Structure 1
Amino acid sequence: KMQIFVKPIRVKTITLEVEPSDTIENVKAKIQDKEGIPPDQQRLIFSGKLLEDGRTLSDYNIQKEYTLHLLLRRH
């Protein structure tokens, strides 16, 4: 018996065009457009926080080229 690894070959990174005034809700809506994930399946994470839908990217000091973390419900 031995051990091997398996990774997806598809690029998992999502690229978005946003404004600092966009809310986390709007960002989740844009993620759905590209990947087709319903908003209530996503939670966005950044700087060690669960980003709340009602706040803006500006509220979290999210600048250009930053990367957000995507949490999904497991089925």
Structure 2
Amino acid sequence: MLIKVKTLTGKEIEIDIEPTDKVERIKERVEEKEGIPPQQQRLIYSGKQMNDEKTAADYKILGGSVLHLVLALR
């Protein structure tokens, strides 16, 4: 499944995921492109912060979904 990850600046990257993938895996894919350690990535799928230990299937993430990567202190 192709999804988009979009940062605060509007930068988009496209990530290829499987429904069995953990959100931690998705962050690994983001790190390949952005450098950002998964530990400090926050990914928001619309409304909620995604927990590293749940899956894409768990969050029912769909083709074309935009996840937002927030690279800022809380």
TM category (shorter chain) comes to 0.7 to 0.9
Please state how far the C-alpha of 1:46 moved relative to its aligned partner.
0.7
Pairs within 5 Å for 1:58-69 = 58-69=57-68
Look up the match of 1:41: 40
Equivalent residue number for residue 29 of structure 1? 28
Which sections of structure 2, spanning at least 5 residues, go unmatched?
1-8
Shift of 1:47: 2.3
The aligned length equals 65
RMSD in angstroms over aligned alpha carbons? 1.5
- Between the two structures, name the one with larger relative contact order (CA 8 Å, sep ≥ 6): 2
User: Counterpart of 1:20 in structure 2: which amino acid?
Assistant: P
Max Rg structure: 1
With structure 1 as the length reference, what TM-score do the two structures score? 0.78
Cα distance per residue 1:51-74 (max 9 Å; x no partner): 000000111110111110111234
TM-score, normalisation: structure 2: 0.79
Secondary structure of the 2:57 match is coil
